[PDB]
Design a binder for this molecule. Structure first.
Ligand SMILES: O=S(=O)(O)c1cc2c(O)c(c1)Cc1cc(S(=O)(=O)O)cc(c1O)Cc1cc(S(=O)(=O)O)cc(c1O)Cc1cc(S(=O)(=O)O)cc(c1O)C2
Ligand code: HEC
Length: 108
């Protein structure tokens, strides 16, 4: 996939409805069902401090960027077979661009 910067405003609403139940974004924010996402961009998969990941999420062995994030969020278990993230994915390209535009700001 090829990320294109979109609307963080639309992305924020998508995060609220699709992601917030399992994830926080703020620095020092708590783990929930899923890990806190602060600092996710640039970091090795499966490496937030204090969170117990699947071996699949750890050993995916990629650094997160906007393009592999878009691919992941299209269909999480297809990109990371073995994942325990129970999210079906955002099939729509604009949704992923907007979400990721938001995530870049919100987890900085
Ligand atoms: O910046 S905005 O988010 O306000 C914006 C709103 C509209 C827009 O048409 C665009 C931006 C331009 C635009 C950008 C992109 S992107 O490169 O992926 O960022 C894609 C499109 C687009 O028109 C094409 C498009 C895709 C989809 S998808 O099926 O979800 O992938 C839906 C739409 C698209 O126009 C419809 C649409 C939704 C929305 S929504 O408010 O975000 O739901 C605003 C506008 C729309 O035309 C009206
Ligand atoms: C129902 C729960 C749930 C939902 C909904 C969910 N997630 Fe997750 N997410 C998780 C869990 C659990 C993990 C850890 C999975 C593992 O260890 O295999 C995870 C992992 C991730 C990771 C990898 C983190 C890392 O450090 O490698 C990212 C990125 C992520 N989620 C983003 C999102 C985004 C963005 C959304 C919404 C679009 C979302 N998630 C929706 C539960 C969820």
């Amino acid at each position: 996939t090829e990320f294109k910067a979109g609307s963080a405003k639309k992305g924020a609403t998508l995060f609220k409805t699709e992601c917030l139940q399992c994830h926080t974004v703020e620095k020092g924010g708590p783990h929930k069902v899923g890990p806190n996402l602060h600092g996710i961009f640039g970091r090795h998969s499966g490496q937030a401090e204090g969170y117990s990941y699947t071996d699949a999420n750890i050993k995916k062995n990629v650094l997160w960027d906007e393009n592999n994030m878009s691919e992941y969020l299209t269909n999480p278990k297809k990109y990371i077979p073995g994942t325990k993230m129970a999210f079906g994915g955002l099939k729509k390209e604009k949704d992923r661009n907007d979400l990721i535009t938001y995530l870049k700001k919100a987890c900085e």
